[PDB]
From a paper:
Abundant filamentous inclusions of tau are characteristic of more than 20 neurodegenerative diseases that are collectively termed tauopathies. Six tau isoforms that range from 352 to 441 amino acids in length are expressed in adult human brain from a single gene by alternative mRNA splicing. Tau filaments consist of a structured core made mostly of the repeat domain, with less structured N- and C-terminal regions forming the fuzzy coat. Here, we report in vitro assembly conditions with recombinant tau that replicate the structures of filaments from both Alzheimer’s disease (AD) and chronic traumatic encephalopathy (CTE), as determined by cryo-EM.
Addition of 200 mM [name] also led to two different filaments with either extended or C-shaped protofilament folds. The filaments with C-shaped folds comprised three protofilaments, which packed against each other with C3 symmetry (filament type 10a). The cryo-EM reconstructions of the threefold symmetric filaments formed with [name], with a resolution of 1.9 Å, showed multiple additional spherical densities inside the protofilament core. Besides additional densities for what were probably water molecules in front of several asparagines and glutamines, the cavity at the tip of the fold contained two larger, separate spherical densities per β-rung, which were 3.1 Å apart, and at approximately 3.0–4.5 Å distance from S341 and S352, the only polar residues in the cavity. Another pair of additional densities, similar in size to those inside the cavity, was present at a distance of 2.6 Å from the carbonyl of G335. Below, we will argue that these densities corresponded to pairs of K+ and Cl− ions. The 1.9 Å map for the structure formed with [name] showed two spherical blobs of additional density per β-rung that were in an arrangement that would be consistent with a pair of K+ and Cl− ions; a similar pair of spherical densities was also observed in front of G335. As mentioned, filaments formed with NaCl are identical to CTE filaments; in filaments formed with [name], S356 and L357 are oriented in the same directions as in the AD fold; in filaments formed with LiCl, both residues are buried in the core. For each monovalent cation, residues 338–354 adopted identical conformations when comparing extended and C-shaped protofilament folds.
Author numbering:
A (entry chain H), B (entry chain B), C (entry chain E), D (entry chain D), E (entry chain K), F (entry chain G), ...: 306 to 379
């Protein structure tokens, strides 16, 4: 047999942005009171009380190309 | 047999933006009171009490191409 | 046999935007009181009490192309 | 004689309020013209002409208990 | 004689408030003209002309107990 | 004689407030014209013309207990 | 001959104003589409297409006196 | 001959203003599309397409006197 | 002959202003598209496309007196 795997990719993933910015975070915490007695946990606990967790992600591009190729015999 | 896998991709994924910005987050926490007694958890707990969790994602592009190619024999 | 897989993709996915922005988030928490006694949980718990969870996603483009190609023999 | 003054006070005077606020005072003065000639005052004068006197009293509670106890011999 | 003054006070005067605020005063003065000629005052004068006198009293509680106790012989 | 003055006070005067604030004063003066001729005052004068007198009192509690006790013989 | 040009001008042109203001211009453009083909103009053209042309003239006085005096011999 | 040109001007052009201001211009453009083909102009063109031309003239007085005097022989 | 040109000017052009100000310009551009082909101009062109031309003139007085005097023989 003759098997030819010859895909052609000339594709563009592209951005232009002029000005990127002017982002202001001023979150304000509240008043939090937690009273706990006789609590049983048998498994994992993720707990957050009054926290101000922030992610700022501001890439000038942030473009992505995911591409996958296989030729496969089982 | 003769088997030919020859797909052609000339595709564009493209953006232009002039000005990207002027984003203001000013969330204010409230008043939170939690009283807990004799609670049993047999399995995983995710808990958040009065927290101000933020994600800001501002890519100048943020374009994506996902593409997948297979030739396969079982 | 002769089998030929020759699709051609000339496709455009495109945006133009002049100004993107002027976004203001000012949520205010209320008054929350929770009293809990003698609760049993046999399975996973997700709880949020008075939290101000925010996601701000503002891509200048945010366009996507998903494509899949297979030639397959079983 | 035996005289016993033994009153018992277990009284509650109580408030709960969630949010107290959003008060806007925007009074605008008019046009006032006063012309006075040959006036005699023999006694105290309180005069106000075109004034914008304000009291804003906004207690979160503002509850009161007044109590009086006497045992008295003349 | 035996005279016993033994009053018992276990009284509560109490408040809870969540959020207290958002008070705006924007009073605007008018046009005031006063012309006075040959006025005689024999006694005290309080005068206010076009003034914007303000009191803002915003106690988070502002609760009060006034109590008076006497045992008296004349 | 036997005279016993033994009053018992276990009384509470109490407040809780979460957030206290966000108070804005922007009073604006008007136009005031005062013309005075041949005025006689024989006694005290309090005068205010076009003034913007302000008191801001914002105690987090502002609770008060006034209590008075006497045992008296004349 | 004796010729005398002796006019006397004692004239007042006067204004009093207390507060002049509180002017808000918020015009919004609509949608305008103009398609033009094979037009000949032999003479001057003044054209405006979707413009938001504004004059704000707010003199505190803005009073005027125009006067003319001539004595003339031909 | 005797010719006397002796006009007397004692005239007042006068203003009083207390407060002059509080002027807000917030005009917004719309959507303008102009398509032009084969247009001939033999003479001057003034054109404005989607412009937000503004004049703000706010003189505290802005009063004027124009006066003209001639004695003339031809 | 005797010719006398003796005009008398004791005239006032006058202003008083207390407060002059609080002027805000926030004009916003819209969306302008212009497409032109085969246009002929034989004379001057003044063109403005999508511009935000501003004049702010705020003189504290801005009063003017124009006065002209002639004695003339031809
Ligand atoms: Cl909170
Ligand atoms: Cl916990
Ligand atoms: Cl908090
Ligand atoms: Cl809350
Ligand atoms: Cl919990
Ligand atoms: Cl829970
Ligand atoms: Cl009076
Ligand atoms: Cl008034
Ligand atoms: Cl006033
Ligand atoms: Cl008076
Ligand atoms: Cl004033
Ligand atoms: Cl006075
Ligand atoms: Cl035209
Ligand atoms: Cl328009
Ligand atoms: Cl426009
Ligand atoms: Cl044109
Ligand atoms: Cl042009
Ligand atoms: Cl524009
Ligand atoms: K909080
Ligand atoms: K907990
Ligand atoms: K905990
Ligand atoms: K909250
Ligand atoms: K809980
Ligand atoms: K809440
Ligand atoms: K007033
Ligand atoms: K008076
Ligand atoms: K005033
Ligand atoms: K007075
Ligand atoms: K005075
Ligand atoms: K004033
Ligand atoms: K427009
Ligand atoms: K045109
Ligand atoms: K425009
Ligand atoms: K044009
Ligand atoms: K042009
Ligand atoms: K523009």
């Amino acid at each position: 047999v003759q098997i030819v795997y010859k895909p052609v990719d000339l594709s563009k993933v592209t951005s232009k942005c002029g000005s990127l910015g002017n982002i202001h975070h001023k979150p304000g915490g509240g008043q939090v009171e937690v009273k706990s007695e006789k609590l049983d946990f048998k498994d994992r606990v993720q707990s957050k009380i009054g926290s101000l967790d922030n992610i700022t992600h501001v890439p000038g591009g942030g473009n992505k190309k995911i591409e996958t190729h296989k030729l496969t015999f089982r």
